[PDB]
Amino acid sequence: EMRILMVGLDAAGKTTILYKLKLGEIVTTIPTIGFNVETVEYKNISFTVWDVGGQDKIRPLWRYYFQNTQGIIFVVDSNDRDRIAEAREELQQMLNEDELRDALLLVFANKQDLPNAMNAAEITEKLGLHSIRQRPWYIQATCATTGDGLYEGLEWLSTNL
Numbered sequence: 346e347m348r349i350l351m352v353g354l355d356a357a358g359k360t361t362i363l364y365k366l367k368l369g370e371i372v373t374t375i376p377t378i379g380f381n382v383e384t385v386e387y388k389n390i391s392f393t394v395w396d397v398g399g400q401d402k403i404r405p406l407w408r409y410y411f412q413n414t415q416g417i418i419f420v421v422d423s424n425d426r427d428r429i430a431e432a433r434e435e436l437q438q439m440l441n442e443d444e445l446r447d448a449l450l451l452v453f454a455n456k457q458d459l460p461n462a463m464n465a466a467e468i469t470e471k472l473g474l475h476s477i478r479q480r481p482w483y484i485q486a487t488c489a490t491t492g493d494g495l496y497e498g499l500e501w502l503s504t505n506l
């Protein structure tokens with residue numbers, strides 16, 4: 346019916362976020378070698394999760410698992426300063442996929458419990474979110490392990506959908 350695509354580098358906290366929603370079992374599928382998909386199905390909504398960044402294995406086939414995406418959730422480890430530039434590049438490629446041009450964008454600046462984590466303002470500038478045109482976006486500072494911030498960010502995505 347409608348899909349929410351939640352993607353980001355490995356260890357960003359996406360699986361942690363799926364489990365905190367308590368909207369259904371997390372199911373892992375491996376449609377092809379090197380492509381692990383995690384899926385939660387709640388009513389008419391499908392939450393679809395996989396890791397981006399690095400080799401981008403089976404990238405040309407991602408379109409056939411993108412379909413009917415109404416909102417993108419980009420999750421970043423705010424403490425991972427080593428890979429923030431990689432997260433920016435991976436986000437930009439998602440923002441250029443034709444099947445996702447109309448999808449809303451929620452950004453979770455995750456792991457705000459860590460002492461040296463970049464704040465949402467810094468994450469906003471590092472991701473280049475203000476260069477996004479004609480697409481509504483929103484960024485929330487979160488701690489997925491406590492759940493802090495997830496409701497406020499998903500409140501924006503849900504009310505705007």
Ligand SMILES: Nc1nc2c(ncn2[C@@H]2O[C@H](COP(=O)(O)OP(=O)(O)O)[C@@H](O)[C@H]2O)c(=O)[nH]1
Nearest residue numbers: 355356357358359360361455456457488489490
């Ligand atoms: N400190 C901290 N750790 C987190 C947070 N969210 C997730 N983690 C940890 O990061 C690791 C990877 O989380 P995971 O959900 O598997 O990330 P994924 O690979 O993107 O799905 C786990 O050990 C989590 O406990 C957070 O907000 N703060």
